[PDB]
Amino acid sequence: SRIINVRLISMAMTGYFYTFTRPRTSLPMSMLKYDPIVRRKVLFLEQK
Template sequence: MSNITTAPLPANPAIARRHGQERYAASPDSPFRRTHEALVSEVGPHCSSIDQGHHKFGYRGLKLTRWIAAKSRTIMVRLISMAMTGYYRTMQRPRAHQPLSMLKYDPIVRKQVLFLEAKRGKK
């Protein structure tokens, strides 16, 4: 057993409660206490958390920005048989090229027929 006794700490008026955590507030004459204007001049007006009067990192943490994914250079297209059999093929083509059309074998009618790229519907 240890000989350390724990006693309740005396109330301290310099403790400020924020979001369930105890933080020590700097006294008015402390060199660590800086004004809002001093922080803006040091960090710059582009820092939104400083402009709103929050502490250096903001109350709500970092703002998350949504990353926009780049479009792929190739797309998958569906080539539909013009024999109207319902048979189709899928192929990959460059995004910048013209729509595909080609003669390919259709196993339902058992001959080569024209396949055209289907129109893409909106999502």
């Protein structure tokens, strides 16, 4: 209940995602990850 599992959706609209955990009483996650569909580092943002 204290920790939630979020989904970091790629901003290349390729449908790839990364799942990381973070506390509810925190800000949304945002990272620069490697999208294997386009094979390039793009911006991944939390789903909601």
